[PDB]
């Protein structure tokens, strides 16, 4: 009874292992990125970024440098970031 | 509030007491 007309396993296994390694990134390195996720009242950092963007739009680059320095120093010390992102309850 | 209290951490939690 003739039927009408109708290597890759290695690539499948390799891509599966690579996708597993990539998925592991969502479960093995999360504790490291906690200082930048659990943040209440991020309004001040967003304010600073918006001021950076606005100053860059205007063309007063000195203020841009000052604000960028401020933001870098903010992300360069966790304690001042905690002090800077308090809930601000009144 | 759930989200308000889940992030209510501060220095006074980690005091040097260790009351044993």
């Amino acid at each position: 009874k003739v039927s009408p007309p109708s290597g890759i396993m290695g690539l499948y296994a390799s891509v599966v292992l690579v996708i597993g390694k990539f998925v592991r990134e969502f479960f093995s390195g999360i504790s490291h990125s906690i200082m930048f996720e659990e943040l209440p009242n991020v309004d001040r950092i967003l304010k600073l970024c918006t001021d950076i963007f606005l100053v860059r739009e205007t063309g007063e680059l000195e203020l841009e440098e000052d604000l960028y320095a401020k933001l870098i120093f903010l992300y360069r010390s966790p304690e001042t970031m905690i002090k800077w992102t308090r809930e601000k309850t009144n | 509030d759930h989200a308000s209290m889940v992030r209510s951490g501060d220095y006074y939690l980690f005091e040097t007491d260790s009351e044993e």
Binding site: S3, P4, I19, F36, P40, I45, C49, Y75 | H2, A3
Partner: protein, 138 residues
């Protein structure tokens, strides 16, 4: 510095969105996590994983011979016998005669199940009448 600023801005914007969301739809205290959303996210992760690992593992008409031919020869000479048959001496086995075929191999030990894979159509016979068609002209 540009890349760092853009990265910071994107993450802070996403965090601001999540803060506004959790402000607009608050939950009182640690009562529970609603079974609906838990089941939804769990089943979504499960179906995603099984689709990633499983779907790559996903992956007849009968005919009759039109011409038959036989050739018998001696060593390296011209063939002594050659004969072909087409559609007239090709007998398709009569259904009753096919039944006598099936039971003809009764006393056979283990070759009946070998032929039970076929039907009364994919098995035919070829008659070759008498003399050779061509001559013998060595």
């Amino acid at each position: 510095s540009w890349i760092c600023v853009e990265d910071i801005y994107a993450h802070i914007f996403i965090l601001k969105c999540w803060r506004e969301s959790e402000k607009r739809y608050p939950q009182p205290r640690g009562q529970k996590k609603k079974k609906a959303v838990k089941y939804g996210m769990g089943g979504m992760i499960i179906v995603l994983l099984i689709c990633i690992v499983w779907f790559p593992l996903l992956f007849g008409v009968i005919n009759q011979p039109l011409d038959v031919s036989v050739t018998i020869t001696l060593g390296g000479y011209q063939p002594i016998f050659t004969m072909s048959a087409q559609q007239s001496q090709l007998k398709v086995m009569d259904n009753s005669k096919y039944n006598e075929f099936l039971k003809s191999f009764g006393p056979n030990s283990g070759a009946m199940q070998f032929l039970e894979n076929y039907e009364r159509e994919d098995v035919t016979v070829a008659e070759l009448e008498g003399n050779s068609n061509s001559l013998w002209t060595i």
